[PDB]
Design a protein around this nucleic acid. Sequence first.
RNA 1: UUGACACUGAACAUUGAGCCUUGAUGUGUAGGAUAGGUGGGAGGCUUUGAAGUGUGGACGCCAGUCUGCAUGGAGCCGACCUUGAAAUACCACCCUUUAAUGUUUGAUGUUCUAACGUUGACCCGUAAUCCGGGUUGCGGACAGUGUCUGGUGGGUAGUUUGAC
RNA 2: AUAGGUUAAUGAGGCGAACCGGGGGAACUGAAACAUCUAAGUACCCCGAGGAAAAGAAAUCAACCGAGAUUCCCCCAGUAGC
Lengths: 77, 53, 134
Amino acid sequence: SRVCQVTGKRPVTGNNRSHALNATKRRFLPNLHSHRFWVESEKRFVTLRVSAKGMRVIDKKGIDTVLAELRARGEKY
Amino acid sequence: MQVILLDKVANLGSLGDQVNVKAGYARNFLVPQGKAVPATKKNIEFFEARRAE
Amino acid sequence: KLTKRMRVIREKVDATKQYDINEAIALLKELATAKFVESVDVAVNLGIDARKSDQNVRGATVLPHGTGQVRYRNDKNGIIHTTIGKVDFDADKLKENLEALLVALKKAKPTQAKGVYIKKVSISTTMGAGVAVD
RNA sequence: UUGACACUGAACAUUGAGCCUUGAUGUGUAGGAUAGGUGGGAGGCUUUGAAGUGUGGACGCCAGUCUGCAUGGAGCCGACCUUGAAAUACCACCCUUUAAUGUUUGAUGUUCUAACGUUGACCCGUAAUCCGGGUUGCGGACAGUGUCUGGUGGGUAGUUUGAC
RNA sequence: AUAGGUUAAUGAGGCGAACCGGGGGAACUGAAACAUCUAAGUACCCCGAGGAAAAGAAAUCAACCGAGAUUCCCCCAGUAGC
């Protein structure tokens, strides 16, 4: 399932409007990428499927602070 | 991103120089190998006297 | 043939650094250690276009101290080499001198004006140094 | 399917630009003057060792200035006159064009590895050619994927195709 | 050191008329054809919940005078607009 494991992003549907305004249902997929994040506290890498934006949330809050919420929600990796 | 040095590493290291390197370079090479310190508010304060002077 | 003398005088200022005029008026009295009554050669750069004849400023500057009149007109590249008095004049006589040129030109500002006027000021005292202020 | 951005990094070299200080560069007519320009206003210089001048960088509209070690040595000019201005006698701002530097991104080349890929090998979770983890080799910032975007597109879909 | 393995403890599972919140989401039809639009975020599908659920105590309106969370009802008005 295409879900960012730190934010909660997911494929939200939309409309692919043409020039002549033809509404055809489409789908906006998040830019997810499986990445290994080195946790120093556990002195171990943690592979996580996160979004590109989610990476920037990690660079701001701190990997450990982020993982605090994951075990808080049970987003088991 | 904003990162503060921990080691020597050339062209961008002098043990304590805050450099704005590229994200990938910091998060996948400098941080995991301890070559640098995640420059967050407290770490900026943790350097100035503890390991700077 | 620039040698030690003018360079020691240039140790007072920097070509890169922009100081305040309150410093340059006191520093120019220490810049010129010459044995003859000199002055300051200021090359003030305009803030508009000096190619359009409707905007160019030409006239007289008011110097209430005393000389008290200096005729000034624009240049080819767009500057004015208006003197700010002799080097022998004191601090407040020079402080009030540059301010006299300011408001006189600011209220006589031309029609199709596009921005704040004074951008670059090139103060160059006779036997002193290369000073850069705003 | 194309390009931009994101995941996406590092150096090295070459090459555009910007920028710091910068040495140069800039002949109307006049001319001791390769006076750019405005140019304040007549002394610089110096015994923290100079001009003339050999050669040379230099610039070379080839009318020339500047001048790197310099035996030389303690002086080498002026302002000023023939200029619409007065001059590398001292002269800034530093620009038009140059070149160097620190830096800054852009685009190409070459290598590297740490992201990333591995339907390569090996060990373990295990009596499982799944998956995951660990070692290691190979590729490697490509590939691939998300968002935007030009092209193509009867593969597919909704429909039109007048009245007389 | 973890991944993993075993046993104990606690909870969950399923059903259910509609009502409620959310994730998806038609066409017929109307437009006297039809593609914007309408139908309608309706039908239907899936998850979750209670007895009600949802919303809820202003980074709201108003208007330079004041009102003060939300919800439901009757007007405002088939008007202002699209």
